[PDB]
């Protein structure tokens, strides 16, 4: 998301980790839409917990299934 | 077979490694063992040792054959 927003992906990610550790524990993300500053929590931008949890479960369930296939058998055309 | 002409790792000589060198070590010791395979024990039989001049010799001693045997190989 930082590369598509025109920001340094390494610099912004390392900056957000310092704001959530040395300062205080909170949610401050990369800026997807144009705004004056950081802290999307001030913008009241929310994502559903059941929606984000459904994403990480399907991503893990598929990643395991891909690792469970070590062989590919593709028949030709008769 | 016979790995050669590596496009990278520019050196003053060829370099091999991996399962290629480990297979050549088995093929080298196999041909050397086959020379002394028939000479083992008193029941063994003599063999002929031919040089580049065209002469030869006949002896059943496995020690004199390996000394005159021409083998070019690091493990050989």
């Amino acid at each position: 998301l930082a590369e598509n927003s025109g920001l340094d992906p390494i610099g912004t990610l390392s900056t957000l980790k310092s704001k959530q550790l040395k300062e205080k524990i909170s949610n401050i993300g990369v800026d997807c839409l144009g705004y004056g500053s950081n802290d999307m929590k001030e913008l009241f931008v929310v994502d559903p917990f059941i929606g984000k949890k459904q994403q990480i479960l399907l991503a893990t369930q598929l990643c395991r299934m891909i690792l469970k296939i070590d062989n590919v058998i593709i028949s030709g055309k008769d | 077979f016979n790995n050669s002409r590596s496009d990278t790792l520019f050196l003053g000589g060829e370099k091999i490694s991996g399962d290629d060198i480990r297979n050549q070590n088995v093929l080298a010791t196999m041909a050397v063992a086959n020379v002394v395979k028939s000479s083992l024990g008193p029941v063994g039989l003599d063999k002929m040792l031919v040089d580049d001049i065209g002469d030869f010799t006949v002896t059943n001693d496995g020690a004199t054959i390996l000394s005159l045997l021409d083998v070019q190989h690091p493990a050989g």
Partner: protein
Amino acid sequence: QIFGDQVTEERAENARLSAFVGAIAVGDLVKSTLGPKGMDKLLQSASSNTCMVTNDGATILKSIPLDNPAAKVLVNISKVQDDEVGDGTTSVTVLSAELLREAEKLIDQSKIHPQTIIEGYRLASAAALDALTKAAVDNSHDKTMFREDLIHIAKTTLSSKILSQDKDHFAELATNAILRLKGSTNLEHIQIIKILGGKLSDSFLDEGFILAKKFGNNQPKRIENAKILIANTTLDTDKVKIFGTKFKVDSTAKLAQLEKAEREKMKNKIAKISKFGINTFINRQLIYDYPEQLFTDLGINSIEHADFEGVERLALVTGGEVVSTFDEPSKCKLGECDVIEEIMLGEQPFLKFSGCKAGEACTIVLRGATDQTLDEAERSLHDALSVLSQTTKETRTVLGGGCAEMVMSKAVDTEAQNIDGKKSLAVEAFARALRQLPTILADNAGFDSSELVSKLRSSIYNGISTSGLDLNNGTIADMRQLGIVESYKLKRAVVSSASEAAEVLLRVDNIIRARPR
């Protein structure tokens, strides 16, 4: 093999070239044909005896089969420009190719985000449209005769329409609904009120923004020095469908305690309303009596059920904003009006506002004898207002012959002066394409463009903003003396179409080839 059946995705390296160089090659077909002195092209088929030669930009682009999937995007852009007006299709494709030509330099040797390049044009095109407005002239001169010519044209538009009963009264309402605006002529600045129990000739014009619904129960009918706030929220019974819920409580009184706690949450929003110092509040939804009773002690009148168009038209007359949320107290765009008076017309209570801040608008109240007289009048009135507004936007021209193209460059260079870091080259690249328009016009004329365009930029930069390029004598002369003007609507259409065409193409990191039909 992704996609298939003639559909494919271009490589990220080739897609940027297909969206730029591939689009320039399409623009190169109409490049040398731009202008009255432009060249001609040849269109040859397989039979080779059916060929033809024409300079039309819309004919050359549509006839030539385009295998480039990015070239089909320019075909859709050409169709959008042809819908506006049947002239200028060539100038849009050429200008779009010049924006994409510099865009290649805005990526390779620049490293600027492509969406910021578009945002760099949105800020540059805004200054370009503002520069065209300052230099805009008109043939509307002798307005005293032009104001009289509008009431006669409005009478011709009333023919075959039921409004033909009285031509003098209705044409005066349509004429005063345009000239008195002194601004945008769009119908969003004109409110229509359809009522019953009267005669068509009894209609009148009122600029007080009459709306049907009333406000308050015991609240007074007059408001002096009103402060208008615009927001959208549900203060009465949110979650409009409560069926299916399960409330776990030991008694019924505890179920109402949660509703009282919801009423305690109302004071959190009501407190933020009182911090704005307003005597009037606007809401699209309804409001329960308890939060409305607290508005009485605070002296806040709440106008409810304003829909949306009614809200946006209220924000334009009072100078407000449509934002439905409160980001922070004492930060917002607020409207206001001098007097809010409640009147009654057609046996229904109406609201007549008075003294809106910088208000320019009008409200035409149509009083019919039935629904057929009200519906057919509003449709025929907008047709009469569209003809009157057509003469205001069209026949209004700007200085041509390279003038307006260079005048916009000076305003974009002014925008390129104060700018953030990454958009400095993006805004400057927009001014380069503006100078390439008179450059290509001087190419087909057979003269030196680098000499004329360079002297034209230095001439307008310091004084003499009316100068332009003279293609007949091959020199720079005043456009007001030579009488060379071009339509302002044509300028706005080319700039708007170039921004819309660049909006889709610059965001492209890959090209999905369209499926053949």
